[PDB]
Amino acid sequence: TFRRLWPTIAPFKAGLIVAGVALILNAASDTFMLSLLKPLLDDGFGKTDRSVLVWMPLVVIGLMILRGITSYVSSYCISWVSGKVVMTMRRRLFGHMMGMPVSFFDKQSTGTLLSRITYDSEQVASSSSGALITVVREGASIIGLFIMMFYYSWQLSIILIVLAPIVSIAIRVVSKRFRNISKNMQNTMGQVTTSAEQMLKGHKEVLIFGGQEVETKRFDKVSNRMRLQGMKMVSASSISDPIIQLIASLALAFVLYAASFPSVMDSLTAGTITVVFSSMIALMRPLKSLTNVNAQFQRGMAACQTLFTILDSEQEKDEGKRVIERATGDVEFRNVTFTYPGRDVPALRNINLKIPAGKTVALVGRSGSGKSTIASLITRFYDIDEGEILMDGHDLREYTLASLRNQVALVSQNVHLFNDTVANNIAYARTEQYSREQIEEAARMAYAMDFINKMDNGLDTVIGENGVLLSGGQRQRIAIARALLRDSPILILDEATSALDTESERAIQAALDELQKNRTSLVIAHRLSTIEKADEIVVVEDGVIVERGTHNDLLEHRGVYAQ
């Protein structure tokens, strides 16, 4: 139940199994390397036999080469499984995030989603594989050390297997106690840090009201309290390991005393006691690691639960089913009002605008509200809170999203150029339904083939980031070319600020009459030239419409039309 991850890692069980075998060999390498001490001392520097010290360097090098090569094999295989489960997790996560509605993508998570794909998904497999290493390698180290101690000295091994659970619980209970103490001290330290934050935050009022003398005198007390809290934190942290080592040394002294008093014991040779004591020092580390393996694993699976919440989150609802291809019917807004998801202030009041068929009715004015969100409403980026958007005699909630978004083409300057070729970028998604002849025809009709064909290889060069890096005016032309692959009877034109693209601005306008040759066009205009050729103008400020005139007819209540 706590995993919900085994199906994803199931196809790669071979890597886990071979990594476990490699780690078993890794632990056995150190176990045999410590077992070497008995021939090193008994057969070596005890009874004089130098022949055992001739091959002892060679067997040390052999076991160390085994240890290095099996450590690398374990790392490679466990990281291969981690890499492939990360690849599958990121693949599913990205496939689900692309389908998620943009309201989730808008300001709920914008830069941390890369961390979800990159950092948290890495952390899941990193912590899980670290836990598996720490429970296999170190567990087998404990088992091998106890086997060796049983084999060489079953008496001291019995004493050690009596106290090893005892010293394990002694480590675990004091670690938990001091970690809880450190958590309480951390909470207090965070409170004082937030007090310092509040001291820093009112910088403007310190300058006017009085000066820095009182603030410095109070920060002296706050920083002294921070210093005392830090000293107590590090004191509680540094009193932990000494106690653990002291209890481990109590166990060490008990084991050494088990060789002292019983005359039936102390039949060990020098090598046997050396091995059974080096086994204790080599067992201290696995005992310390096995106690903390569950915390690491639970951290990993907590990150994995965080990554699963996004994975199985609500996706973009596709309840509408009306399929539409080349709608000649026009869009109409009837008292539709939209509030931004995240806020409560309606940025768009009841809109009764009906944009006609084939016309170029624009929207004028920086409303700081749902002026731009009408574009989002046409393409169903943000679902309309109340009202109906009726295009071609049917509400947008009835249409299939895939068919509907094919009807609408969005032209802007903030255009995400996909990391592909120019031909694929201006024929994205439907890269096979348009052939390179259509690409050339649309580029020539876009008044944009001159610089595209100038661009290195032409239509087959790479347009992506860290590439040719076309400009914003050139991005307008590329988006217009993508729209001039047609199959988009609804045009929505952002127009940006129209920062003097000049012959490319004339390209935008010539291509705009080419688009509006048959397209129902809604322009969120910031250029008066588009207003001049606009057949109708509706001006919205602060989410409320003020006029529905037409340029010179609109000058009855001028306001800011001159500017």
Applying the rule CB under 8 A, the residues between 523 and 562 that interact with a copy of itself are 542
Site for a copy of itself in 391-410 (CB under 8 A): 402, 405-406, 408-410
Check binding of 249 to ligand JSG (CB under 6 A): yes
Check binding of 464 to a copy of itself (CB under 8 A): yes
| Closest separation in Å from C-beta 473 to a copy of itself | 18
Spatial distance between the Cα atoms of 278 and 257, rounded to a whole number of angstroms? 16
Which of ligand JSG, a copy of itself, none does residue 284 bind (CB under 5 to 8 Å by kind)? ligand JSG
Size of the site for a copy of itself (CB under 8 A): 136
- Cβ-based neighbours of 494, under 8 Å, separated by 6 or more: 372, 375, 410, 411, 412, 413, 414, 524
Letters for 536-555 (x = contact with ligand JSG by CB under 6 A, - = none) are --------------------
Among the candidate windows 109-117, 161-169, 171-179, 180-188, which touches a copy of itself by CB under 8 A? 109-117
Question: Which H or E run contains 387?
Answer: strand 386-391
Spatial distance between the Cα atoms of 389 and 140, rounded to a whole number of angstroms? 67
3-state secondary structure 371-383: CCHHHHHHCCCCC
Among the candidate windows 184-192, 244-252, 336-344, 468-476, which touches ligand JSG by CB under 6 A? 244-252
Classified as helix, coil or strand, 347 is strand
**Eight-class DSSP state of 264:** S
Check binding of 132 to ligand JSG (CB under 6 A): no
Q: Is 329 labelled as part of a ligand binding site?
A: no
Which of ligand JSG, a copy of itself, none does residue 163 bind (CB under 5 to 8 Å by kind)? ligand JSG
Site for ligand JSG in 253-292 (CB under 6 A): 274, 277-278, 280-285, 287
Among the candidate windows 5-13, 50-58, 151-159, 518-526, which touches a copy of itself by CB under 8 A? 50-58
Decide if 327 contacts 406 (C-beta within 8 A).
Answer: no
Site for a copy of itself in 307-326 (CB under 8 A): 316
Question: Which H or E run contains 291?
Answer: helix 270-291
| Closest separation in Å from C-beta 163 to ligand JSG | 4
Check binding of 266 to a copy of itself (CB under 8 A): yes
> For the chain, first and last CA: distance in Å?
64
Measure CA 503 to chain center.
Answer: 42
Q: Is 370 labelled as part of a ligand binding site?
A: yes
| Closest separation in Å from C-beta 372 to a copy of itself | 12
Classified as helix, coil or strand, 389 is strand
| Closest separation in Å from C-beta 28 to ligand JSG | 12
Residue 409's beta-bridge partner residues?
491
Name the strands in the sheet holding 394-395, side by side, starting at the edge strand that comes first in the sequence: 346-351, 331-339, 386-391, 394-395
Q: Which of 305, 360, 300, 349 is nearest to 513 (CA)?
A: 360
Size of the site for ligand JSG (CB under 6 A): 27
Give the β-pairing of 362-364 and 520-525: parallel
Which ranges of 100-153 would DSSP assign to H, the alpha helix? 102-105, 112-115, 121-152
Binding site for ligand JSG (CB under 6 A): 30, 33-34, 36-37, 40, 60, 160, 163-164, 167, 241, 245, 248-249, 251-252, 274, 277-278, 280-285, 287
| Annotated binding residues for ATP | 365-372
